[PDB]
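Q: I have five molecules that I believe assemble together. Could you output structure tokens for the complex as a whole instead of separate predictions?
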Amino acid sequence: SKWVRLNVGGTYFLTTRQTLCRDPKSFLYRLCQADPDLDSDKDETGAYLIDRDPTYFGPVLNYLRHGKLVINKDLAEEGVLEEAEFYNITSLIKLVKDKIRER
Amino acid sequence: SKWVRLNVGGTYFLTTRQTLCRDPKSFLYRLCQADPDLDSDKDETGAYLIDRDPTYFGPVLNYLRHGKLVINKDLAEEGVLEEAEFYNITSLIKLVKDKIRER
Amino acid sequence: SKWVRLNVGGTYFLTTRQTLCRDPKSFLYRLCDSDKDETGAYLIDRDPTYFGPVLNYLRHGKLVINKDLAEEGVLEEAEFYNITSLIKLVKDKIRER
Amino acid sequence: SKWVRLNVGGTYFLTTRQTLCRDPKSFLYRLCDKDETGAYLIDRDPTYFGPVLNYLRHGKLVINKDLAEEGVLEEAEFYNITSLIKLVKDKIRER
Amino acid sequence: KWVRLNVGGTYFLTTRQTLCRDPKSFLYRLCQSDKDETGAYLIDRDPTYFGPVLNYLRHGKLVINKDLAEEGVLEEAEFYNITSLIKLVKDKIRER
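A: Yes, here they are, computed for all five components at once.
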């Protein structure tokens, strides 16, 4: 299964293992690996259930896709930070913290 | 049932009982207790029905998830305050009112 | 049931009869079948982004509008739904923007 | 059928024949290709459609602060609503 | 004629004519790849930045809302290899 569906707080995201496997130290890596104890946290669509805000997930997932932090002006950088911390993407945590500092 | 679906004013949110139990004094706490007389207040999908604005609920649920108050630049703090007061999350009410005051 | 579903311009809102019963002179008070869809939602040929602040006003009596939402859009809707007290509130926000 | 559903770029809008039969020169009139729900399919951006449909509803151009006027203009031109096109060009010209 | 795209979990409905606009693009193969059960082509990219890419294929203009990061649209224009769009976005960014 190249494709992986995530239900982040009620909103569906579609991605791949090429993307989710990019940071071995991230929570998302357990999804990359199809960690058997996450099996029960899937909904009827087979999507992994994640109890986080989907609006701040976009920039996190995009960072895994192309290595750039891109955040629209109408999205609080602080929200993305909280998500980068939760998913434990340390290079992204640093980028967001730096961005917040440059203000 | 670790996972709980809420239908807040027509928009679905997915979260866990743990997150909704975080403040035992709040409106939300009765859900995570599975309180009897919420039965007629669920829809066909099993979601608990709530007659409140889903857009202002975002920051409320996010506060329950990570303890930070995060509000995007275009979102009226007053909206979030009304919801925090409606759900009766006292530490959140304080955070929002502090946010408003520094304005 | 107490619960009432509205399809406003294609976007679904969920509310209760108690909320829609607020203003007996409003359009929405009639909701307090030819104009319902298969889900049982009442059909309304209006913009759903301007409806938010209207329905919230019915919920908690306050006028709350986000910084990017056009207040003129909300004014149109308040007049459309004929919520006299809300119309006034919006005419105020605009007087002194 | 009083009620008409439009699938604009994958996003559904609900409106009435009354609203769509407003300007007989418009693309939308020309329909007052459906998906399995009976919605008329339109290959255009739904995010810029709001102001167009609303203009048909109540004759006013209302564009939220976020939305690029140029996006609304492209739509007004595509749907061929000439008085709306004029209103949008005005808004752009006066920046 | 109609083509459905599942971009990062969000569906877009368009047409072969639109997706055919630039034969050199990644999208050109879809206007003649995995699909989900709905018949939509699966694309592992951000749907928010897709909007202006697809709009450009529809009417040839770069249209970017004020709050949308141009850099987001640039990444997508590059990913889909729409060379004329890549130039427009870069140009827009330079003129900042």
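A: One point stands out. Chain E has one domain: 1-96.
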